[PDB]
Symmetry: C2
Amino acid sequence: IRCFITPDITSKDCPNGHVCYTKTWCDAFCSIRGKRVDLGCAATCPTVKTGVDIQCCSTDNCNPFPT
Amino acid sequence: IRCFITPDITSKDCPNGHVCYTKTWCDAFCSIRGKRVDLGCAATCPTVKTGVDIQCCSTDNCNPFPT
């Protein structure tokens, strides 16, 4: 069977990477639910789409899900 | 560098699977944000932890993120 999967958030080695990042943006219900979150890794801090904020950092696992 | 990753929700072939599932449960702010969602695949509809509801279905991609 083929299904949609929501894989668990986990920590991964990005051998070519030098920063971790946290992208945040507002969806339809941002007022009550808060900003959406995307966590990743990259060689350099990536440029983002319109309406997206990004925070980059340079220690392992420096991008936990925001509290 | 090692970082936390939120992988994109996508559709995947589970060759040994016969159902797709949608697990839902309430976190701290379930009143305003709605239930949390976990999407996956399994051979049979899995038994779930306390406070978790599960919906299983048997067509490909029958488990989209709830609207």
